[PDB]
Design a protein around this ligand. Structure first.
Ligand SMILES: C[C@@H]1[C@H]([C@H](C(=O)O)[C@@H](C)O)N=C(C(=O)O)[C@H]1SC1CN(C2=NCCS2)C1
Ligand SMILES: C[C@@H]1[C@H]([C@H](C(=O)O)[C@@H](C)O)N=C(C(=O)O)[C@H]1SC1CN(C2=NCCS2)C1
Ligand SMILES: C[C@@H]1[C@H]([C@H](C(=O)O)[C@@H](C)O)N=C(C(=O)O)[C@H]1SC1CN(C2=NCCS2)C1
Ligand SMILES: C[C@@H]1[C@H]([C@H](C(=O)O)[C@@H](C)O)N=C(C(=O)O)[C@H]1SC1CN(C2=NCCS2)C1
Ligand SMILES: [Zn+2]
Ligand SMILES: [Zn+2]
Ligand SMILES: [Zn+2]
Ligand SMILES: [Zn+2]
Ligand SMILES: [Zn+2]
Ligand SMILES: [Zn+2]
Ligand SMILES: [Zn+2]
Ligand SMILES: [Zn+2]
Lengths: 266, 266, 266, 266
């Protein structure tokens, strides 16, 4: 006779958990996560910003890389998120306990973060992480300024209701670089059509493709580097093959249209 | 020499606080609030739904009117909201403590409700009420069903980010009546253009006028009855002069355009 | 070269997950959990109370057993907890989404429940579950009444800060039965002396042994049945060997004193 | 005919709202609130701590006084509280939005703070303020260290369940000064005996008198300065008449015994 199943751990490809040393993207912007998960540190004369943290077990590695960059825990002022799933917001709660960092996020992301990814529209309770509270709620198009770096929120609902692209301007070789950190546009295993928990899912994705296509975007980065053709392990060539925001949006839309057609058939 | 000012109470016109007996709108739908604030009770064989509660001091009156209708505290199953300002969601926290009711709301409304209306985009902390937590988060177009009455959420952001119209079909004289409880479309004292806390405010209002115009709408009701030309004190004629949803949206848009032109001049 | 470790699932002995049919304890009190985790249903003419839910994956089984007892989801009015660890409060969030149930708990338990067991004083983030909010905060000695069954909270901090014994009087063979659901008194792997996160841990445990010893206690039940010598699989003899509250407190204190002496040596 | 009453503002004696310039208590400790409400700034080489903020309208004044002391908003690292009523925790939410400050509090205080003082055990919803979330939960006797100043929490439940005395050691004229910031011990209009929302109220107060009596206490300060015979407007003599912790506890207990005897008679 038969017990209920044991809880299943959220396991991921090893490369998503492979620590790397900081990789510079522009004068004040560094990739400090793992080989296959983005976590961006932006260092300013007035403290540091982190965009995403990756998986829940990455907190100590992130703090190690911050220290290597000259950022102590007090100096971390702000955490921003692409979306509040466990592989991107995983260590946010712990980072808040261990640093000076406060979280800014939109209402949708704040609600999902506050329940630790539980009651997900598509995953249920299958992929959870430690819950965290947001200190500031942002609206679409709102700006946050740290040490003179101006971050702009661009809502791009679909992958989660609260999915956000964050843009800012850094410098490189003397010139401005408009960086776009665009969120995921995948729909992994999602019911797209007639989903009772997300009735306008398709319309939202279509609007989000258009938003991403139009972002100020000299350099695109994504939560999974492979989605934008980054290879964080390739050193001086890590970004050489990166997609434009236009190409990223177009590729995501073509994949999405294929998934819709497969869903209608299946 | 000069102390800081005393806190100012949120005071309103007396008619907003004038209790009235239940006024029937359709076979299962009643106005149970005050003369000038809507609070709608929908009674089903499987429990009751409340849409809005009015001001914070209205909890006991609402419970009195529910009892008069045959609804005990256990029978109240669900509270829905137009928007989470103090004159519409005021008594929600107390109603939850005193009844079986759970709250369903969108993420924006849930966040504002959870802070008791504090840190409002336009009012700051000037108009607060007891905070309450939402038990269910709804997405645009999602349905909630109680005792066979199907309520549909239609997001109409503007007055607050989380403003929602709720629609359902009741019956009257043997025939279906498509009831639309459309939220406020006012912008009282708001900075409309270039508002850093709400950069897309104007676009959202314009989309919301179009949403309201298109609602299924045999009978329109609004949080302030006068906004839809209801007179709750007029008895058998209370709804005689009510606007259509199309006329309500058109009047709100004309007022909004006037306010924009005045803001540009002022 | 070496990736960070994968997340580890919270796995438990199979018997903790082995469904059982409802086992009657007294006229209105039933064990409805698994062979080795207590979840008590108390059925009243005015709805049902659940004390604990067990592991997170037990929600559907609990609802199955409630249905077998004549308790539909609307009829479940109240969830009470021994303490907010994953093997006792695991399915509370899901039960709230799927039933009419509201949670009453003390402040300590509410705070831990709201973070899903994360940032535990002793376990860190190693044993988490879906977070849930409390609808009512109770103080020590406060009573909650459902359908004429009066439940009294007796704080017994130690195993967690918010650990609580719940007592009530049922009937059996015509006579009153004072039931005591006393919380765990274990300290599994805990640093007892000089713990910076719990400086008064030892004093709290000692006071809690005295509280448990003095409870009104014709029948003792515990979150792990074996702690009170219950065998839920033994049918008509399931409770035959149960400890008194006095014996349970004495055995817990002797174990605790042994652990203290081992900690001093180790 | 008769409308429901208007909401009543929480108004206080003018002296509670009378700004004062910073008054030094010891080498790193300053009173920066108003004439009749304590708000203590402790400045360290590693940032500043605030103990209490006073009334909700005091945020800007507090920030003015911090700036005068050389403390910018980024430098404020920690807010601690005596208890979470509106005249002591009033501006905490706003201070969090406007500074780097994180809140540490016990579970009881965190729960009350998170509901903005609503559903108070004795005041109901009559005295509310903007809700705020705690970033760290502290246990009795736990220490928090900022820039080498060690703050110790001493729970003294009664006035609120979460009432806390905070102690630390500063210096003055070359010598250590053990400062005790002991919470209120009043019971204003409280039902003391047989209170269903606080059954152990009397026992808690009695234990709290003993806690206060025993604190390390070269200098006592209290949330209302008059309770410890401080006169913040008396300049160089402001603290001359201050009570010892022993005298404060004794006076509070004598008042409490008188109130008990009056309650029995009334
Ligand atoms: C299932 C993935 C995971 C998931 C989530 O967050 O939804 C978490 C909960 O496991 N993250 C994803 C995302 O898009 O963020 C999805 S798609 C994945 C990334 N892929 C690539 N293929 C080639 C270049 S990268 C496929
Ligand atoms: C200032 C109003 C108030 C406010 C809010 O909620 O914003 C609360 C916080 O005081 N509620 C309003 C709403 O639109 O809901 C606004 S407009 C008011 C209703 N009016 C009518 N004129 C004629 C027919 S009704 C003017
Ligand atoms: C490690 C156990 C577990 C743990 C917790 O809640 O702390 C969760 C997080 O895995 N639950 C326990 C409790 O006391 O509740 C502890 S002790 C366990 C019960 N035991 C018995 N031995 C014989 C008769 S029963 C040993
Ligand atoms: C009613 C007071 C107020 C109240 C609270 O916090 O309970 C808030 C909500 O208005 N604060 C108090 C406290 O003890 O903190 C109580 S007693 C007050 C202070 N008194 C003195 N008399 C002489 C020297 S000071 C009488
Ligand atoms: Zn995702
Ligand atoms: Zn992902
Ligand atoms: Zn409003
Ligand atoms: Zn209004
Ligand atoms: Zn436990
Ligand atoms: Zn256990
Ligand atoms: Zn007080
Ligand atoms: Zn006070």
């Amino acid at each position: 006779e038969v017990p209920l199943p044991q809880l299943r751990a959220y396991t991921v490809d090893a490369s998503w958990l492979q620590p790397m040393a900081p990789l510079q993207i522009a004068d004040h912007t560094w990739q400090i996560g793992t080989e296959d998960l983005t976590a961006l540190l932006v260092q300013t004369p007035d403290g540091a910003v982190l965009l995403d943290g990756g998986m829940p077990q990455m907190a100590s590695h992130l703090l190690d890389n911050m220290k290597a960059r000259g950022v102590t825990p007090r100096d971390l002022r702000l955490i921003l998120l692409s979306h509040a799933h466990a592989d991107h917001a995983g260590p946010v709660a712990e980072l808040k306990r261990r640093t000076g960092a406060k979280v800014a996020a939109n209402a949708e992301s704040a609600v999902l973060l506050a329940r630790g990814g539980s009651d997900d529209l598509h995953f249920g309770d299958g992929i959870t992480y430690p819950p965290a509270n947001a200190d500031r709620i942002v609206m679409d198009g709102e700006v946050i300024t740290v040490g003179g770096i101006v971050f702009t929120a661009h809502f791009m609902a679909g992958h989660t209701p609260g999915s956000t692209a964050w843009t800012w301007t850094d410098t490189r070789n003397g010139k401005p670089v408009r960086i776009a950190y665009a969120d995921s546009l995948s729909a992994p295993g999602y019911q797209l059509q007639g989903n009772p928990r997300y009735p306008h899912l398709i319309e939202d994705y279509r609007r989000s493709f258009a938003t991403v296509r139009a972002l100020p975007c000299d350099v695109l980065l994504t939560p999974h580097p492979g989605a934008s053709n980054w290879d964080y392990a390739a050193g001086a060539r890590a970004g050489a093959k990166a997609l434009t925001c236009k190409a990223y949006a177009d590729a995501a839309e073509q994949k999405f249209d294929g998934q819709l057609a497969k869903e209608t058939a299946g």
